[PDB]
Write a protein that binds this DNA or RNA. Sequence first.
DNA 1: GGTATAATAATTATACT
DNA 2: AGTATAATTATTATACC
Lengths: 108, 105
Amino acid sequence: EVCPYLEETFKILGRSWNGLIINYLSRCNDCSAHFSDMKRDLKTITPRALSLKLSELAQWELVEKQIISTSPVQIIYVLTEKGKALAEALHPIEAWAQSYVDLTDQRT
Amino acid sequence: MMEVCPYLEETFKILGRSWNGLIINYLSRCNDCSAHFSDMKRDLKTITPRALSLKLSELAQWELVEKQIISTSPVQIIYVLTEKGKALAEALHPIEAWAQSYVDL
DNA sequence: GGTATAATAATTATACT
DNA sequence: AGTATAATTATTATACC
């Protein structure tokens, strides 16, 4: 029967965007990006979806929202060590994806 | 500018939904990576039969879990992790190790 | 070993600043 | 660098057999 830690982990992983967002941040310089970077490179995410996800990720303490006192002010999203570790745990998923997924496949 | 892998993206279409990762992991720890409908329903604790059925059809389309008909005396219906499904299950171990170290609970 | 029907929760579309 | 309103999907809650 089922690992309740794994159950908990899918409460974030088993929803839209979370996995892709933490993977994207793990690849950025300093593991950080602005709202507009993520919207641009995630391609099909809406601003409202991106805002909600970032806020849930901040609650899960996977992503940190930092106010930077530059002029004008910058707002950057940065992976926590906990988030960075989760990002590492996704590499073999990436590997599986490049081995087994065919993008031409059709489904209902 | 810092593009996302399309294959990873496609993978999250299954993983980034309710139940799919849990079902694939469950099936990976069953004898012969096989289970009956009621087995999964009982062991997943809180899944509705309709969510289970939908998800099993979803996973069949991805060719992750095959629904097999064993034409015995009363017919048995078995859901079976494919080799592709087994590889996915394996690739979920480091996530489970991360959960151990970080999740609270 | 599941389906039918109905309601809720998650996600997206659009528009806007 | 995000919010607002409304629609559309995804998921669940009950029944039922």
